[PDB]
Design a protein around this ligand. Structure first.
Ligand SMILES: Clc1ccc2nc(N3CCCCC3)c(-c3nnn[nH]3)c(-c3ccccc3)c2c1
Length: 134
């Protein structure tokens, strides 16, 4: 009931920092990094009962995940990794862990002022992506 109210909406990328390095750390190859790094995706978040859906729509790739908090699921990432993901709420932050091939990355989505701030970490490399209402 009302868990993710402040996340619901259509969010357009307005700034990105260190995403190319993050992608390199994750194992994305050169051509994909270049093309993905140009894109300005829309992240569309909705809730129906306990089910949260997060879609990303872009010129490069479109992605979609639906999930229940705390319940592991299969995910195909934009770079075509086949991962096992779990998303929880921790102190009002959506925390998304992706596991594949013995590796792990954590993605946090936070509401800060009128923005949605997304921090992606792979080992020592952190990237920040800022999205505003579309
Ligand atoms: Cl190659 C590659 C590798 C990993 C990626 N992870 C992303 N996420 C950042 C937002 C939180 C979830 C993770 C995103 C993304 N999704 N929505 N906005 N950026 C992309 C991506 C998708 C479409 C167009 C450009 C970039 C992406 C691309």
């Amino acid at each position: 009931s009302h868990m993710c109210d402040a996340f619901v909406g259509t969010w357009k990328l307005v700034s990105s920092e260190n995403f190319d390095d993050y992608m390199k750390e994750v194992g994305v190859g050169f051509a994909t990094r270049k093309v993905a790094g140009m894109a300005k995706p829309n992240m569309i978040i909705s809730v129906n009962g306990d089910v949260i859906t997060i879609k990303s729509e872009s010129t490069f790739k479109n992605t979609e995940i639906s999930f229940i908090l705390g319940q592991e699921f299969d995910e195909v990432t934009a770079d075509d990794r086949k991962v096992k993901s779990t998303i929880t709420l921790d102190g009002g932050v959506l925390v998304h862990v992706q596991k594949w091939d013995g590796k792990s990355t954590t993605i946090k989505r936070k509401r800060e002022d009128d923005k949605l701030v997304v921090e992606c970490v792979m080992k020592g490399v952190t990237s920040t992506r800022v999205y505003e209402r579309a």
